[PDB]
Design a protein around this motif. Structure first.
Motif, PDB file in Angstrom:
ATOM      1  N   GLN A 187     -16.005  38.316  -1.606  1.00 13.01           N
ATOM      2  CA  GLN A 187     -16.438  39.693  -1.804  1.00 13.01           C
ATOM      3  C   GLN A 187     -16.523  40.012  -3.288  1.00 13.01           C
ATOM      4  N   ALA A 188     -17.667  40.550  -3.703  1.00 18.11           N
ATOM      5  CA  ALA A 188     -17.882  41.037  -5.060  1.00 18.11           C
ATOM      6  C   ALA A 188     -18.022  42.551  -4.983  1.00 18.11           C
ATOM      7  N   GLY A 189     -16.983  43.264  -5.411  1.00 17.66           N
ATOM      8  CA  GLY A 189     -16.949  44.702  -5.249  1.00 17.66           C
ATOM      9  C   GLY A 189     -16.921  45.087  -3.784  1.00 17.66           C
ATOM     10  N   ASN A 190     -17.967  45.773  -3.330  1.00 12.26           N
ATOM     11  CA  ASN A 190     -18.111  46.099  -1.916  1.00 12.26           C
ATOM     12  C   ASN A 190     -18.910  45.048  -1.158  1.00 12.26           C
ATOM     13  N   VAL A 191     -19.792  44.326  -1.849  1.00 13.06           N
ATOM     14  CA  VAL A 191     -20.657  43.355  -1.192  1.00 13.06           C
ATOM     15  C   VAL A 191     -19.832  42.173  -0.702  1.00 13.06           C
ATOM     16  N   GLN A 192     -20.165  41.680   0.487  1.00 14.05           N
ATOM     17  CA  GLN A 192     -19.567  40.470   1.033  1.00 14.05           C
ATOM     18  C   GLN A 192     -20.532  39.309   0.841  1.00 14.05           C
ATOM     19  N   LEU A 193     -20.027  38.203   0.303  1.00 10.34           N
ATOM     20  CA  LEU A 193     -20.843  37.018   0.080  1.00 10.34           C
ATOM     21  C   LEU A 193     -20.744  36.074   1.272  1.00 10.34           C
ATOM     22  N   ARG A 194     -21.884  35.508   1.658  1.00  6.61           N
ATOM     23  CA  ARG A 194     -21.973  34.608   2.799  1.00  6.61           C
ATOM     24  C   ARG A 194     -21.914  33.169   2.300  1.00  6.61           C
ATOM     25  N   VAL A 195     -20.859  32.455   2.680  1.00  6.93           N
ATOM     26  CA  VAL A 195     -20.665  31.076   2.242  1.00  6.93           C
ATOM     27  C   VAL A 195     -21.463  30.155   3.157  1.00  6.93           C
ATOM     28  N   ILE A 196     -22.344  29.344   2.566  1.00  2.00           N
ATOM     29  CA  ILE A 196     -23.177  28.427   3.340  1.00  2.00           C
ATOM     30  C   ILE A 196     -22.637  27.004   3.347  1.00  2.00           C
ATOM     31  N   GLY A 197     -21.643  26.698   2.520  1.00  2.00           N
ATOM     32  CA  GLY A 197     -21.081  25.359   2.471  1.00  2.00           C
ATOM     33  C   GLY A 197     -19.837  25.349   1.612  1.00  2.00           C
ATOM     34  N   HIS A 198     -19.103  24.243   1.699  1.00  2.00           N
ATOM     35  CA  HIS A 198     -17.867  24.104   0.944  1.00  2.00           C
ATOM     36  C   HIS A 198     -17.569  22.632   0.707  1.00  2.00           C
ATOM     37  N   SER A 199     -17.103  22.322  -0.502  1.00  2.00           N
ATOM     38  CA  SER A 199     -16.599  20.993  -0.827  1.00  2.00           C
ATOM     39  C   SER A 199     -15.231  21.125  -1.483  1.00  2.00           C
ATOM     40  N   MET A 200     -14.719  20.042  -2.061  1.00  2.00           N
ATOM     41  CA  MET A 200     -13.436  20.090  -2.754  1.00  2.00           C
ATOM     42  C   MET A 200     -13.451  19.061  -3.870  1.00  2.00           C
ATOM     43  N   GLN A 201     -13.287  19.523  -5.104  1.00  2.00           N
ATOM     44  CA  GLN A 201     -13.227  18.655  -6.274  1.00  2.00           C
ATOM     45  C   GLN A 201     -11.808  18.711  -6.825  1.00  2.00           C
ATOM     46  N   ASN A 202     -11.061  17.622  -6.639  1.00  2.04           N
ATOM     47  CA  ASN A 202      -9.671  17.526  -7.069  1.00  2.04           C
ATOM     48  C   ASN A 202      -8.830  18.651  -6.474  1.00  2.04           C
ATOM     49  N   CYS A 203      -8.509  19.668  -7.278  1.00  4.80           N
ATOM     50  CA  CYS A 203      -7.666  20.774  -6.837  1.00  4.80           C
ATOM     51  C   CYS A 203      -8.413  22.103  -6.813  1.00  4.80           C
ATOM     52  N   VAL A 204      -9.742  22.075  -6.772  1.00  6.71           N
ATOM     53  CA  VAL A 204     -10.553  23.284  -6.849  1.00  6.71           C
ATOM     54  C   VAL A 204     -11.505  23.324  -5.663  1.00  6.71           C
ATOM     55  N   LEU A 205     -11.519  24.454  -4.958  1.00 12.15           N
ATOM     56  CA  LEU A 205     -12.514  24.702  -3.927  1.00 12.15           C
ATOM     57  C   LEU A 205     -13.834  25.114  -4.566  1.00 12.15           C
ATOM     58  N   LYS A 206     -14.934  24.587  -4.034  1.00 10.84           N
ATOM     59  CA  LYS A 206     -16.278  24.942  -4.487  1.00 10.84           C
ATOM     60  C   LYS A 206     -17.057  25.469  -3.286  1.00 10.84           C
ATOM     61  N   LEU A 207     -17.016  26.785  -3.095  1.00  5.35           N
ATOM     62  CA  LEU A 207     -17.779  27.421  -2.033  1.00  5.35           C
ATOM     63  C   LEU A 207     -19.218  27.633  -2.480  1.00  5.35           C
ATOM     64  N   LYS A 208     -20.149  27.485  -1.541  1.00  2.00           N
ATOM     65  CA  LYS A 208     -21.571  27.682  -1.797  1.00  2.00           C
ATOM     66  C   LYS A 208     -22.013  28.949  -1.075  1.00  2.00           C
ATOM     67  N   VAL A 209     -22.346  29.981  -1.841  1.00  5.88           N
ATOM     68  CA  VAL A 209     -22.778  31.248  -1.288  1.00  5.88           C
ATOM     69  C   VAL A 209     -24.301  31.328  -1.342  1.00  5.88           C
TER      70      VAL A 209
END
Lengths: 306, 305
Positions: free
Chosen positions: B69-91
């Motif tokens: 969520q950015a402010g009031n807007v909700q972001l739709r995640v279309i994919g997800h990976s994982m690089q070491n210790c960091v989540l990388k969501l694809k909106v």
């Protein structure tokens, strides 16, 4: 945990910083709605500043003598006005990045954040405190006039300072956003100096409260003191006299910590009399006086078991 | 005049801070283009923070539980990976406020500004330093995970830190924006002991150059020492060894003040053995090691962005 001198995020102020050029002088301006606020000495020359008649010099100037620059976009001045030591420049377009704001005049001892700017662009942000002599120990250079001080509560940006000049001792003086200086200072090239500065005692105790919350507690003693016996000992070390409102405002911290206000003053006396013995409180060999009790609560959080 | 511990303008970073809620766990995310960066243990509950099999817990994670969520807007995640210790969501929506940026890893002794956020809303900004033991003396409360550190050069925001955890002594550990932890730390709330913290020597010397510029020069001596004899006293006072690369960095500062790099080392050797005798340098009775040589030039020149 942790405790740092923290400034507010400067995002909402960067969207209002522009560049004001009048003749050969260039300082910073505050673009709110369709008005640009800047120090009025932008119209003077180096010779005018020795004895400026701001009413005459502003009468001579015209709208096209003011170049307002919002980055690369030229802002068209459609009217000029004055209010105390602040010049108000009406423009054609309102600033689309205008945040919820309000002009306020703070009291000595409070704190705020300064966005240092040059040619309308930000250079950095730090946390200041209005000293009892109505000066600030800021970091300003040539061209930093127009830089504003502020506090952000919820979403409203409370503008409270506009830089104007530096004093012979290196400290800084300015006005509120309505053009009234803080202290006995004038925007004239005349002999001026900051008055004798006293330490903000109410802030020093809130700083000592933050240390007990953060684990530092070697300064704590088993002795006590009275308010009168503290108000006089501090005057030898040039501290502010602790008022009753100062003891009361240290209340929420006293309940969160469980150490009464008069008990914290006793530990302060031993540190002023016999020094800190080379030790450090929160990594400072000196006693810090630029944290208001509200800033300690805002950062240390902490609960009160009623 | 004046000299403060000054932080970079946080404008270009605030427009990138979003909220990430997976399960009951909520932390902060870094929205750049259509990728949301955040610590991977947003998939973890507070109970599963001892020793979690992150790859296994992520195999049982779904995109519709990944709330952004950015402010009031909700972001739709279309994919997800994982690089070491960091989540990388694809909106789906690209971040319109995306500034010119770059991912970097910093060395011990460098500084950067931390933008403390909670529930995706920035709350404070302060200047910090990557300590030699690869920790930071920051200010973080519950919910500050995902807060990032950065420097600014020209118009490029150089991301270099992402908050992950608080250590027993109160110091904090984090990773770069590629997921790699700084120092010998892991994303497990276990007994992790930060090593012996030494003092950054090149930053104290640069902080002395700022004192000479701002009218504090009592510590300036006429004596001179060698680079070898300088590190002699430094090792016995828990200071980093001053290499030749440190001397060349202090070059521009040495030229502006007309003081030799080793002449300032002689001024520092006396301040280490004999203290400061109740005096204050730039208003501080302690030697400040969180000012890099660039930070001294940046403030004393009014460099903008």
């Amino acid at each position: 945990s942790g405790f740092r001198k923290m400034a507010f995020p400067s995002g909402k102020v960067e969207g209002c910083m522009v560049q004001v050029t009048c003749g050969t002088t260039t300082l910073n301006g505050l673009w709110l709605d369709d008005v640009v606020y800047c120090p009025r000495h932008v119209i003077c020359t180096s010779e005018d500043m020795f004895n400026p008649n701001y009413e005459d010099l502003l009468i001579r100037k015209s709208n096209h003598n003011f170049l307002v620059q919002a980055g690369n976009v030229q802002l068209r001045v459609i009217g000029h006005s004055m209010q105390n030591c602040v010049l108000k420049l009406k423009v054609d377009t309102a600033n689309p990045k205008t945040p919820k704001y309000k002009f306020v005049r703070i009291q000595p001892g409070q704190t705020f954040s300064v966005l240092a700017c040059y040619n309308g662009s930000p250079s950095g942000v730090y946390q200041c405190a209005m000293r009892p002599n109505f000066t600030i120990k800021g970091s300003f250079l040539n061209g930093s006039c127009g830089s504003v001080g502020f506090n952000i509560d919820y979403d409203c940006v409370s503008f409270c300072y506009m830089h104007h000049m530096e004093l012979p001792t290196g400290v800084h003086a300015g006005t509120d956003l309505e053009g009234n200086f803080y202290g006995p200072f004038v925007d004239r090239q005349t002999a001026q100096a900051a008055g004798t500065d006293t330490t903000i005692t109410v802030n020093v105790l809130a700083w000592l409260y933050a240390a007990v919350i953060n684990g530092d507690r070697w300064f704590l003693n088993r002795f006590t003191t009275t308010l009168n016996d503290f108000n006089l000992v501090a005057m030898k070390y040039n501290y502010e006299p602790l008022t009753q409102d100062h003891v009361d405002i240290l209340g929420p911290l006293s309940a969160q910590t469980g150490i009464a206000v008069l008990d914290m003053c006793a530990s302060l006396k031993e540190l002023l009399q016999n020094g800190m013995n080379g030790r450090t409180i929160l990594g400072s060999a000196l006693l810090e006086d630029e944290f208001t009790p509200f800033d300690v609560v805002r950062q240390c959080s902490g609960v009160t078991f009623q």
